């Protein structure tokens, strides 16, 4: 899980593959949070109106 | 478990019958995989689970 550990214990060529899975997952996690936040924001926006 | 024998002068005086061991006890409980919720104290001890 730790990004540094992978960087520390793997080759530069080897990091194309391992880091990529981590990055893809994290973007999805971020995407879910942002999407959820907008939906929550709308409810609050409606409440504010 | 290993055992302790309280050998005295009143005993017959041999390895087969000469012993007055007295009170002793132990409990054995088997362990299996389970999920535990652990609460940690401010100091760091596990108060309850």
């Amino acid at each position: 899980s730790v990004l540094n550990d992978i960087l520390s214990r793997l080759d530069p060529p080897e990091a194309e593959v391992q880091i990529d899975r981590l990055i893809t997952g994290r973007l999805q996690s971020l995407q879910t949070y942002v999407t959820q936040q907008l939906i929550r924001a709308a409810e609050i926006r409606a409440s504010a109106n | 478990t290993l055992l302790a024998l309280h050998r005295s002068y009143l005993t017959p005086g041999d390895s087969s019958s000469g012993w007055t061991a007295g009170a002793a006890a132990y409990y054995v409980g088997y362990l299996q995989p389970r999920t535990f919720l652990l609460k940690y104290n401010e100091n760091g001890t596990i108060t309850d689970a």
Partner: protein, 147 residues
């Protein structure tokens, strides 16, 4: 892996190394069985006869000097290790540096890499635990091995 052809070549010949041919079930990972027995197949078990459908547990090698190099014996050593389980005894060649406190720095403590200001902390580490973590499971405290 490596070759030691010269060491494995004897005038008399070498046959003290044996690999198993047959076994009822697959061997478990990182598990070794040196039991001396003979594999039994189906009916008519040999019961030590080593007769039809019964086999001795292992077969001898054929390492010979005349033997072709391509198929000639290799010396193979497997190095296996696991990390972050506990304090690591087997550190590498790296040389230590003086501790710096309350200044942002790059610190490698026992194979752990992160970046933050380091400051002395009051928390009572019970003698047993090396690390520390916060509510969201991120490293928060460490104990310098020398310090």
């Amino acid at each position: 892996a490596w070759n030691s052809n010269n060491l494995d070549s004897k005038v008399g010949g070498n046959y003290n190394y044996l690999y198993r041919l047959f076994r009822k079930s697959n061997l478990k990972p990182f598990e070794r069985d040196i039991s001396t027995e003979i594999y039994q197949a189906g009916s008519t078990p040999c019961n030590g006869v080593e007769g039809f459908n019964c086999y001795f547990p292992l077969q001898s090698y054929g390492f010979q000097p005349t033997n072709g190099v391509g198929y000639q014996p290799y010396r193979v050593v497997v190095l296996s290790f696991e990390l972050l389980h506990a304090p690591a005894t087997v550190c590498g060649p790296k040389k230590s540096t003086n501790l710096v406190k309350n200044k942002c720095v790059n610190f490698n403590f026992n194979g752990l890499t992160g970046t933050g200001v380091l400051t002395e902390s009051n928390k009572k580490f019970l003698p047993f635990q090396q690390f520390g973590r916060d509510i969201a499971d991120t490293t928060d405290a460490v104990r310098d091995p020398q310090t």
